[PDB]
Each structure stands twice: as structure tokens, then as C-alpha cells.
């Protein structure tokens, strides 16, 4: 209702995470694994 899941084309948007779709902005972002930060799960973060 507030998030959905991303298309098949967006397989590699999240380097270290899973893609999310935000419906109110009509945008797409990432849910990063533990220990990785950045909009695309870019860099490893201290702990």
C-alpha cells in the first residue's frame, strides 16, 4: 500500500540490496543489506 517491488529490468540497481518502489513519489530506491549504505547500497559502512 506504501511500497511495491521493482521490475525485472531493475535487477542491478541495488548493488547490495533489494529494490523498492515508492508509490506516492512514483520512484524507485533500495533496501540495503546490513552493513551497506548509499542510495544504491554502494559502500560498506563501519558496523
Amino acid at each position: 500500500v506504501s511500497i511495491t517491488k521493482c521490475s525485472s529490468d531493475m535487477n542491478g540497481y541495488c548493488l547490495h540490496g533489494q529494490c523498492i518502489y515508492l508509490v506516492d513519489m512514483s520512484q524507485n530506491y533500495c533496501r540495503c543489506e546490513v552493513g551497506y549504505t548509499g542510495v544504491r547500497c554502494e559502500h560498506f559502512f563501519l558496523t
Binding site: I20, L22, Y29, V34, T37, G38, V39
Partner: protein, 500 residues
């Protein structure tokens, strides 16, 4: 003097189970009162305490508050958004989509002490449970030049919120209690007044270099400084080191003159930074200029002749939004000896990124970086060619200065590699910043080096964990050569030894 935190630019991106996200927000903005980047309150679930948010008083970039089912967000003493970077290139503040499945999300945002946003606008949308935000008059806070790009979905479907106390003028309040009354300081001053006064009293009118307001007329009484601050005063420009004498038509030294660093006027530039002749601390000298050391001072000097390539770092200039070095930008580092910024080596380069239209990177081209001896910022290596045993391309790298540091802390990071050794034989100085060596499953010789003799500041720490165990490496014979064990070794060979 004020406590300092960097900030986050992850935007609407989440880190882990919402727990871990909350832990990261708490860890970053705990005991922080000046935010040097962006303040991002995202994915904050209900029944979670945001008490530390009370400490924040100043934010340089944008403030985003989104996707929060937590009821209260206590940014009560925040006083200024400098808007030094925007959200969606237009919004200095944005409170968006803080709602729940049963329409039970954000309810309270008592920003009673916000008075100015120098650059940018704000945008409000999908705020179903937020109370009393409708009452706020944003013409005071935002500069006029931005009132156009100012978006405003102030609508409350719930409509079950306590109205504004009589002490709140025009019925404008950020919450309930009469302390949440929207104090105004912009237009309600006087015709002669230009600075943001205390009130309509022309006597209670503030300096231009005041930002939010003032407790008194002089510039020492400014609540927040607009541009620079010198000790306790606010200034448009830091006091020059030398002033013109109109009578003698010559230059004369200024006693109150101090150097320019960031938004501060400091008597001494930091050591790793460079000093320009104008009297300011710079992170990099412009083109046709170089860095030397003269009489105890690292200074920029104009060059005519040899000089060198500019060699800007990743994230800067040519590499504006570049995540890593790769085929599209690897050619620009042909004969770079010093890197004016940072280097990011990430796995996406070797895999390739179709979204940024980046083809895969040939490992053999990394050898181009053998000519680099100096990096002014930080070096982050999260990926390396599996076939190689060491960081061969940085065998001639000698110094990392740590002017810019990853997450504000690390100047050298080597993570998630199959390398057996480091091979940084020519490395001698890490001027500032900490060194993390982690996740390197086959690395052994890193624990022999006394990194403290490569550090230029007391307090620089080394975090070497999650690599191949020292006992295992000793058992397999992966230890320093015996002809060279005074100080350590970057690998098995005598050449990889340091003191020898």
C-alpha cells in the same frame, strides 16, 4: 566548538530490517548539534524514541523526513536550513509520506525554533496524521526568491488535532503547548530593517549577518551566522590577513586577521590542508597551480612549465556522480602522480553498470594507476581483480593525506578482496584518517606493519578484522621473510619488506 556530525545522503534508501535503519540513524545523529550534510529521518517505525533529534540546531544541506510511522519527531531546537544542497534539486526541507496502513503515522513535528532557510523551498505531501502543520506560515522562513518552487499539500483527512494557543499569532503553531507557537522574524520588522528582527519593534532589529534572529543588535548577538563566524562574531568575509591603507597606498598587516576554513575563521589551518596566499584553507589548488611546502606551510603556488595533469578524484568534476573508476573514466588517469580527491574501486566497475551506461572494466587497465604516488583524499578498494595477489597498481603510492575521509573517518579502506598480500611497498604516510582492513579472506601480512609510524596524527586508529587468521597464515608459512623483520612486510618477498 559545537558538536559535529556528518549526515546522510542515502535519500529514501533503507539499510536492513527497520531496526538496523533506526540503529544507524541513532548512531549517526546522537549528540549531534551541527549537521554538515543532510538530515534524513526515514523509515522510523512507531514505538521508537527519537530523543536525540532534540540536539540538532543547524543543518547545512537538506532535511528529509519520510516514511515514518513514528508518532513524534522532536526537532525542537533546529534553527536553520542552509540549503547548501537540495532534495529533487528544489527542496531544502521535505516531509513526505509519513503514514501507516491504518493511517496511523507521524503526528507531531514540534519545530518551534526553525526561523530561516537561506536557500531552497520545502514540500509537504501525503501527511495524513500530521497535526497542526497546516497552520505554519512559510513566507517567514523561506527567502522570497524561492517562494515560487514552494509546494504545499497541506491537507489533513483526520482533522483531529488541538488548535493553536492564543500566544501563537495568526493561529500558527507547530504543535500544542504555547511553546510550539510559530515565532516570526522576517517580514514583521520595519521598512529600514533588512536583518531578521526579534519583532516589529524597530529597536529590536538584528544584524544582516544574523541568520535566524538575534538576542541583541551587535553581530556577537546573532543566533546563527549567515556566512562566516569569527570566534563568537559573524562576518560576511573572514578578516583579511593584510588590509589596504587608503592613506599610504600600501598593504598593512591586520591583527584580528584570521584564516578562512569552511564557515569558520581559524587562526591556523589544519595540517593536511593547503594554505592559499589569500589567507584561506583549501582542499585543492586550481589548475596551473601546485602544492609545495615552504617554511612549515603547505601552500598553493602558480606553475608555469611542468606542472601536471589536473587528476581530479572520483565524485569531483568530471567524475561528478561516478560510483567507481572504470572504462568510461579510466583513461583520464594515464600519468597522474597526485590525485586531487578520492578513489573508489567498486565491484560494479568489473561487473558493468547498464544504468549508467558503463561497460565492464578490463583488469589490466588498472595498471594505469601505477604512476600515482599521492592521494589527497581517501582510497576505497571494495573490488580487485581476483587473479591478482596484491594491490600491484599502488606499489608506488607513497602518501594518503586524508583531507576527505570516507564517512568522515576512513582514509584507507581495503575490503572484500581475495588478495594474499597488500603490496603497498612505497606507502609511508597516512596524514589523517583511520584504516580499515576487513573481509579479505586470503590476506595475511597486514598485521606485521606498525601502522602508527605511517600516521601523522595522534588518535588515528587501525581496524584490521575478518581477514585470514594470523595463526592460519603462520601455519601456511605466509609470514615476513626472515632477512627483514624489524618493522613488518607488505608481502612474502624481501622487496615487500619495509625496514629490511
Amino acid at each position: 566548538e559545537k558538536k559535529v556530525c556528518q549526515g546522510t545522503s542515502n535519500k529514501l534508501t533503507q539499510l536492513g530490517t527497520f531496526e538496523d535503519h533506526f540503529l544507524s540513524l541513532q548512531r549517526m545523529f546522537n549528540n549531534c548539534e551541527v549537521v554538515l550534510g543532510n538530515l534524513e529521518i526515514t523509515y522510523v517505525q512507531r514505538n521508537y524514541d527519537l530523543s536525540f533529534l532534540k540536539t540538532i540546531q543547524e543543518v547545512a544541506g537538506y532535511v528529509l523526513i519520510a516514511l515514518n510511522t513514528v508518532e513524534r519527531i522532536p526537532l525542537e531546537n533546529l534553527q536553520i536550513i542552509k540549503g547548501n544542497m537540495y532534495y529533487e534539486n528544489s527542496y531544502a526541507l521535505a516531509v513526505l509520506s509519513n503514514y501507516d496502513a491504518n493511517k496511523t503515522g507521524l503526528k507531531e513535528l514540534p519545530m518551534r525554533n526553525l526561523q530561516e532557510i537561506l536557500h531552497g523551498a520545502v514540500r509537504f505531501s501525503n501527511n495524513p496524521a500530521l497535526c497542526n502543520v497546516e497552520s505554519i506560515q512559510w513566507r517567514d522562513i523561506v527567502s522570497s526568491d524561492f517562494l515560487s518552487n514552494m509546494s504545499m499539500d497541506f491537507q489533513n483527512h483526520l482533522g483531529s488535532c488541538q488548535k493553536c494557543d492564543p500566544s501563537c499569532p495568526n493561529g500558527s503553531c507547530w504543535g500544542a503547548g504555547e511553546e510550539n507557537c510559530q515565532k516570526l522574524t522576517k517580514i514583521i520588522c520595519a521598512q529600514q530593517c533588512s536583518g531578521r528582527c526579534r519583532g516589529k519593534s524597530p529597536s529590536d532589529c538584528c544584524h544582516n549577518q544574523c541568520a535566524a534572529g538575534c538576542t541583541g543588535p551587535r553581530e556577537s548577538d546573532c543566533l546563527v551566522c549567515r556566512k562566516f563566524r569569527d570566534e563568537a562574531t559573524c562576518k560576511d568575509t573572514c578578516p583579511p590577513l593584510m588590509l589596504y591603507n587608503p592613506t599610504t597606498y600600501q598593504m598593512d598587516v591586520n591583527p584580528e586577521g584570521k584564516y578562512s576554513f569552511g564557515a569558520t575563521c581559524v587562526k591556523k589551518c589544519p595540517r593536511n590542508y593547503v594554505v592559499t596566499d589569500h589567507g584561506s584553507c583549501v582542499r585543492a589548488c586550481g589548475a596551473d597551480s601546485y602544492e609545495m611546502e615552504e617554511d612549515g606551510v603547505r601552500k598553493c603556488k602558480k606553475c608555469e612549465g611542468p606542472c601536471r595533469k589536473v587528476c581530479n578524484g572520483i565524485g569531483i568534476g568530471e567524475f561528478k556522480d561516478s560510483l567507481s573508476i572504470n572504462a568510461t573514466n579510466i583513461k583520464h588517469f594515464k600519468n597522474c602522480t597526485s590525485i586531487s580527491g578520492d578513489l573508489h574501486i567498486l565491484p560494479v566497475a568489473f561487473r558493468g553498470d547498464s544504468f549508467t551506461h558503463t561497460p565492464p572494466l578490463d583488469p589490466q587497465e588498472l595498471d594505469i594507476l601505477k604512476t600515482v604516488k599521492e592521494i589527497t583524499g581517501f582510497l576505497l578498494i571494495q573490488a580487485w581483480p581476483e587473479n591478482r595477489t596484491d594491490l600491484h597498481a599502488f606499489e608506488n603510492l607513497e602518501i594518503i593525506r586524508g583531507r576527505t575521509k570516507q564517512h568522515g573517518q576512513f582514509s584507507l579502506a581495503v575490503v572484500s578482496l581475495n588478495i594474499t598480500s597488500l603490496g603497498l611497498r612505497s606507502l609511508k604516510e597516512i596524514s589523517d584518517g583511520d584504516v580499515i582492513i576487513s573481509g579479505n579472506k586470503n590476506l595475511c601480512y597486514a598485521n606485521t606493519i606498525n601502522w602508527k609510524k605511517l600516521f601523522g596524527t595522534s588518535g588515528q586508529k587501525t581496524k584490521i578484522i575478518s581477514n585470514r587468521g594470523e595463526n592460519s597464515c603462520k601455519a601456511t608459512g605466509q609470514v615476513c621473510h626472515a632477512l627483514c623483520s624489524p618493522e613488518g612486510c607488505w608481502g612474502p618477498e624481501p622487496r615487500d619488506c619495509v625496514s629490511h
